[PDB]
């Protein structure tokens, strides 16, 4: 039985510009088994209108999924991705770092 | 298009 902890990346589809519609992505990859919980958060609260790709996997059989939601970034709005998997003692919350 | 002849293990 193989268990792989998920790698998590939180980013926007296009360079972020306050006031402009964009897409917030949470790409979860390299995990196994396939059961995983992924939620995008807006100021600590779950976003409902979130879509996700169809489950697929890489050469090493590890799984990957893209969760995304349309959004308009602002200066005060904090976004993050909450991920829970059997490999995590507690849910992992990754903040969206606009900079970088 | 998908293949055929995929048998059970």
């Amino acid at each position: 039985m193989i268990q792989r902890t998920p790698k998590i990346q939180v980013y926007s589809r296009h360079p972020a510009e306050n006031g402009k519609s964009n897409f917030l992505n949470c790409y979860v990859s390299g995990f196994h088994p396939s059961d995983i919980e992924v939620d995008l958060l807006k100021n600590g609260e779950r976003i409902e209108k979130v879509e996700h790709s169809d489950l697929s996997f890489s050469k090493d059989w590890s799984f990957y999924l893209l969760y995304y939601t349309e959004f308009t970034p602002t200066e005060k709005d904090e976004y993050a991705c909450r991920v829970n998997h059997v490999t995590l003692s507690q849910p992992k919350i990754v903040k969206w770092d606009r900079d970088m | 298009a998908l293949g055929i002849g995929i048998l059970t293990v």
Partner: protein, 273 residues
Amino acid sequence: GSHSMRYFFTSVSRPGRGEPRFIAVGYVDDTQFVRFDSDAASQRMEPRAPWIEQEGPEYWDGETRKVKAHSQTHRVDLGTLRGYYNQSEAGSHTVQRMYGCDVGSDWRFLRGYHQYAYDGKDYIALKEDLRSWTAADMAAQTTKHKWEAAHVAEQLRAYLEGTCVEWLRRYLENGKETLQRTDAPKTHMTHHAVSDHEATLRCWALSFYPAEITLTWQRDGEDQTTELVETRPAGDGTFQKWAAVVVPSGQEQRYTCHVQHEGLPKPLTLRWE
């Protein structure tokens, strides 16, 4: 350049929760074109790319029939594998299958593959010659003997070397406008001071297709080691990736980022300036 068609199948047993989950997705290079989800409403193979929607009802009915056949075979596999390994019914297990074909720049057969995994590990697979199998362990040997005696590889090879390549050519044609495109990466660099004596340079590549790309850092014209993130999907059919390097404050000039991508006539070289 080269192209490929690949189908990925995932089957997950759900102890005490009925029927196992079954997900199948088809790809042409890095572009998904169809999907089947046991938990979706249609219970049919569905399009996930514009150029595939032009296929007629005969196509969709045929793919739906075949994907359901795959689902059924996998449903049985889960029970059989649990037995081979004498595992309890209490745990969920995973079956994964991947198969497809690669073609060269001349759209002619280059390679074929059909691999199968149990619980995230190789179980059995066709060798590159598509004539024999490589079983990972003792339990998989049983499957290998059954498939050799039933001449499974022969029918699979016929598909992987012909039919698979034919459909691939067809798709590349019908989806020429998207599949036969190349979006050069849009690049730039960012600089962030870690400490008062250290700084991290990040090299960005955005909006590129296909996903294949190489980002390498160099200090004084020589490869050097550097953080590298996995190439990630933008969500619009393009990908992104970055590579960072921690440099001594005041030595940025020494470092150069090099980008390689089939969309770049010649490799790019970036520097913090």
